[PDB]
Design a protein around this ligand. Sequence first.
Ligand SMILES: CC(C)(COP(=O)(O)OP(=O)(O)OC[C@H]1O[C@@H](n2cnc3c(N)ncnc32)[C@H](O)[C@@H]1OP(=O)(O)O)[C@@H](O)C(=O)NCCC(=O)NCCSCC(=O)c1ccccc1
Ligand SMILES: CC(C)(COP(=O)(O)OP(=O)(O)OC[C@H]1O[C@@H](n2cnc3c(N)ncnc32)[C@H](O)[C@@H]1OP(=O)(O)O)[C@@H](O)C(=O)NCCC(=O)NCCSCC(=O)c1ccccc1
Lengths: 137, 137
Amino acid sequence: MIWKRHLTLDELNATSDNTMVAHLGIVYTRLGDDVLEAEMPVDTRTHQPFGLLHGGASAALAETLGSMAGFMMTRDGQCVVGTELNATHHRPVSEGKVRGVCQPLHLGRQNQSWEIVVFDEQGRRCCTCRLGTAVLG
Amino acid sequence: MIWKRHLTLDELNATSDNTMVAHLGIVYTRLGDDVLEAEMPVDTRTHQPFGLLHGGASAALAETLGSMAGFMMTRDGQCVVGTELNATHHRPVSEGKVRGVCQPLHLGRQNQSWEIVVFDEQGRRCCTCRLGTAVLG
Ligand SMILES: CC(C)(COP(=O)(O)OP(=O)(O)OC[C@H]1O[C@@H](n2cnc3c(N)ncnc32)[C@H](O)[C@@H]1OP(=O)(O)O)[C@@H](O)C(=O)NCCC(=O)NCCSCC(=O)c1ccccc1
Ligand SMILES: CC(C)(COP(=O)(O)OP(=O)(O)OC[C@H]1O[C@@H](n2cnc3c(N)ncnc32)[C@H](O)[C@@H]1OP(=O)(O)O)[C@@H](O)C(=O)NCCC(=O)NCCSCC(=O)c1ccccc1
């Protein structure tokens, strides 16, 4: 069980208040031993002008998940910031909700690397991301 | 101009209606020969839980600009999709607005590559992004 800082899904979801996370309708849906998951709507809040899920929404869902997972891997007075994000958009999404699933690749003392995969409502992989973070303080 | 479609600023801003672009308060501020710029507020819509600009918001700004640049490289029967995104978060921002500036790196007939730099109000570079797009059809 990797987490060093322990939050419930309720506490996690309350962190989203007055942030972009809540603004995109992102809701954390699962906290496992080594996995964090959230759902995100595919609607006007996350669409691009031609009816698809905006690639920037999948990206934001990935930085959200990687950064909060990173947060739960630190101790009080420590902050986690995203430093490097990349994403590959494999398949379009036109409707439903997507699920982001975040797992650790590398858990360092000052740097972390997180994998976030985004799946559509049929369970198909639509985006693979990797987020590098810095642990500060 | 490099663009295939000769659009106007008013036209670009009209595409944002009912999409993530409007939801994040992104506004196109400059459409030049070879450059597309937009501004984005740093507020609760684009914040992360600890008061900073969410890195996913810079990413979303970058994918917005590069894909709309790619759209302007399409013919009528065609569409644009973002395929690869990467971003480096150099500096945090907490208030005011940031400005994204998009310029072409490579304009192929299948694929394109765009640079998007995001600046704070003092003109300090806060994020550097690169976006691959695909023209389909
Ligand atoms: C087309 C790509 C790039 C390469 O193709 P590939 O390597 O050969 O992959 P495959 O073709 O093998 O499988 C892919 C599926 O595409 C399907 N299909 C295509 N056309 C049609 C059609 N007419 N009818 C039916 N189906 C069609 C295929 O059949 C296939 O479906 P399937 O699995 O059932 O066989 C593909 O990887 C992709 O779509 N990535 C997601 C990009 C993305 O969503 N980026 C984010 C949004 S855009 C940026 C943005 O946010 C933005 C912001 C502001 C403004 C503007 C924008
Ligand atoms: C800390 C990094 C990674 C390295 O350090 P470094 O390269 O050695 O840094 P320096 O040696 O140059 O010295 C510091 C400089 O930075 C400035 N500054 C410093 N402190 C503050 C401050 N408190 N307040 C304001 N400004 C501050 C100083 O002015 C100073 O510059 P200078 O001396 O020239 O005046 C740095 O590159 C960075 O902050 N990147 C942006 C990361 C980012 O924002 N990612 C996105 C958000 S987090 C993820 C997320 O979205 C998320 C989502 C959901 C949940 C959770 C999260």
